[PDB]
Scaffold this motif. Structure first.
Motif, PDB file in Angstrom:
ATOM      1  N   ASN A 199      34.719 -11.010  39.082  1.00 15.89           N
ATOM      2  CA  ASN A 199      34.039 -10.969  40.370  1.00 15.89           C
ATOM      3  C   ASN A 199      33.443 -12.327  40.721  1.00 15.89           C
ATOM      4  O   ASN A 199      32.919 -13.033  39.853  1.00 15.89           O
ATOM      5  CB  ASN A 199      32.943  -9.904  40.364  1.00 15.89           C
ATOM      6  N   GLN A 232      39.953   1.322  43.424  1.00 18.02           N
ATOM      7  CA  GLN A 232      39.010   0.267  43.769  1.00 18.02           C
ATOM      8  C   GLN A 232      39.673  -0.916  44.461  1.00 18.02           C
ATOM      9  O   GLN A 232      38.994  -1.909  44.745  1.00 18.02           O
ATOM     10  CB  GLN A 232      38.271  -0.215  42.514  1.00 18.02           C
ATOM     11  N   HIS A 254      26.433   3.059  38.174  1.00 16.84           N
ATOM     12  CA  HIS A 254      27.605   3.910  38.332  1.00 16.84           C
ATOM     13  C   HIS A 254      28.903   3.112  38.352  1.00 16.84           C
ATOM     14  O   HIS A 254      29.966   3.675  38.071  1.00 16.84           O
ATOM     15  CB  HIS A 254      27.478   4.732  39.614  1.00 16.84           C
ATOM     16  N   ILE A 255      28.843   1.815  38.670  1.00 17.50           N
ATOM     17  CA  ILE A 255      30.057   1.003  38.740  1.00 17.50           C
ATOM     18  C   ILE A 255      30.544   0.549  37.374  1.00 17.50           C
ATOM     19  O   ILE A 255      31.646  -0.006  37.275  1.00 17.50           O
ATOM     20  CB  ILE A 255      29.850  -0.231  39.638  1.00 17.50           C
TER      21      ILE A 255
HETATM   22  C1  LIG Z   1      34.657   1.151  38.750  1.00 15.25           C
HETATM   23  C2  LIG Z   1      33.816   1.061  39.997  1.00 15.25           C
HETATM   24  C3  LIG Z   1      33.484   2.232  40.672  1.00 15.25           C
HETATM   25  C4  LIG Z   1      32.736   2.217  41.845  1.00 15.25           C
HETATM   26  C5  LIG Z   1      32.364   3.509  42.513  1.00 15.25           C
HETATM   27  N1  LIG Z   1      33.249   4.497  42.483  1.00 15.25           N
HETATM   28  O1  LIG Z   1      31.259   3.616  43.061  1.00 15.25           O
HETATM   29  C6  LIG Z   1      32.324   0.996  42.364  1.00 15.25           C
HETATM   30  C7  LIG Z   1      32.634  -0.184  41.713  1.00 15.25           C
HETATM   31  C8  LIG Z   1      33.364  -0.162  40.525  1.00 15.25           C
HETATM   32  C9  LIG Z   1      33.601  -1.425  39.798  1.00 15.25           C
HETATM   33  N2  LIG Z   1      33.119  -1.612  38.524  1.00 15.25           N
HETATM   34  C10 LIG Z   1      33.453  -2.841  38.056  1.00 15.25           C
HETATM   35  C11 LIG Z   1      33.058  -3.276  36.680  1.00 15.25           C
HETATM   36  C12 LIG Z   1      34.172  -3.488  39.056  1.00 15.25           C
HETATM   37  C13 LIG Z   1      34.271  -2.587  40.170  1.00 15.25           C
HETATM   38  C14 LIG Z   1      34.946  -2.812  41.494  1.00 15.25           C
HETATM   39  C15 LIG Z   1      36.300  -3.511  41.396  1.00 15.25           C
HETATM   40  C16 LIG Z   1      36.237  -4.961  40.953  1.00 15.25           C
HETATM   41  C17 LIG Z   1      36.089  -5.165  39.447  1.00 15.25           C
HETATM   42  C18 LIG Z   1      34.709  -4.862  38.929  1.00 15.25           C
HETATM   43  O2  LIG Z   1      34.042  -5.752  38.415  1.00 15.25           O
END
Ligand code: A1IUW
Length: 131
Positions: free
Chosen positions: A88, A40, A29-30
């Protein structure tokens, strides 16, 4: 049944199934949507990541037929994991999750035989530049 269009329809279906399994994998999901810098708490993400990429961006390019070779789909997926390993820190949860889905994606390329589509792509380009 062996036409270039049949193969082109095949790896489009394999990529569509790949991008779905990545969206369903643990922590996937991320990577589904692009990083919202404010939500974020990462105001410098797009100052480091200049070529952003998400699963939704790849699903759209698949729906609009914007991939010419099967190697182009992998490059967009790998770009997600490369942007993850860049921004990261190596011991962060996101970097660990990114490496876990990276392994899953590369192993899915082996199980689905997607790599054999990339190899025939290279051979066809050779048997075409020779004329
Ligand atoms: C978009 C996103 C959404 C959620 C969610 N809503 O659960 C959680 C984590 C992230 C995320 N994805 C990536 C690719 C990253 C991050 C966090 C910020 C640092 C950059 C990084 O690598």
């Amino acid at each position: 049944l062996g036409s270039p269009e049949f193969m082109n329809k095949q790896w489009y279906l394999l990529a569509n199934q790949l991008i779905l399994s990545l969206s369903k994998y643990e922590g996937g999901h991320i990577f589904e949507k692009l990083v919202d810098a404010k939500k974020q708490n990462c105001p410098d993400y797009y100052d480091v990541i200049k070529n952003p990429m998400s699963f939704s961006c790849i699903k759209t390019k698949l729906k609009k037929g914007q991939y010419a070779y099967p190697s182009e789909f992998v490059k967009d997926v790998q770009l997600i994991f490369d942007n993850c390993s860049l921004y990261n820190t190596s011991n962060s949860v996101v970097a660990i999750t990114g490496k876990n889905i990276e392994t899953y994606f590369n192993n899915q390329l082996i199980v689905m035989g997607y790599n054999n589509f990339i190899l025939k792509e290279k051979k066809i380009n050779d048997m075409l530049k020779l004329v």
